[PDB]
Design a protein around this ligand. Sequence first.
Ligand SMILES: *[C@@]12=NC3=[C]C([C])=C([C])[C]=C3N([C][C]([O])[C]([O])[C]([O])[C]OP([O])([O])=O)C1=NC(=O)[N]C2=O
Length: 109
Amino acid sequence: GLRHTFVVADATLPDCPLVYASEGFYAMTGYGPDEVLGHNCRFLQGEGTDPKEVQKIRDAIKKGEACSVRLLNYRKDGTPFWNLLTVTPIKTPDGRVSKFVGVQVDVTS
Ligand SMILES: *[C@@]12=NC3=[C]C([C])=C([C])[C]=C3N([C][C]([O])[C]([O])[C]([O])[C]OP([O])([O])=O)C1=NC(=O)[N]C2=O
């Protein structure tokens, strides 16, 4: 299939830090687990990232609904790539959101 990555965000903490990321996420972004785990994914953003699309993610996270946006992210070396982000809320049996899982595809073509 297509080349994608995978991360898990812990919604029980107020800012949804990352608790697990697939090896492709580390290889794609240039960042390692010692600089990714425990942080919000927004470190990938930079100057050309649209504050409108970023707002669609923030609202969906606060509302506990899924979202799919096209962002401009930056590797550790500062080079830009285009990220097709899709975040999905994972809820407990009582309806509360516990984790946020996101698939990231580099659609720079
Ligand atoms: C990021 N991937 C990513 C993966 C998951 C599972 C979640 C929940 C979020 C992301 N983001 C967005 C980021 O964490 C944050 O939610 C946004 O910056 C919007 O919130 P604020 O209020 O801080 O602006 C991802 N953002 C990226 O740029 N790249 C991803 O791969």
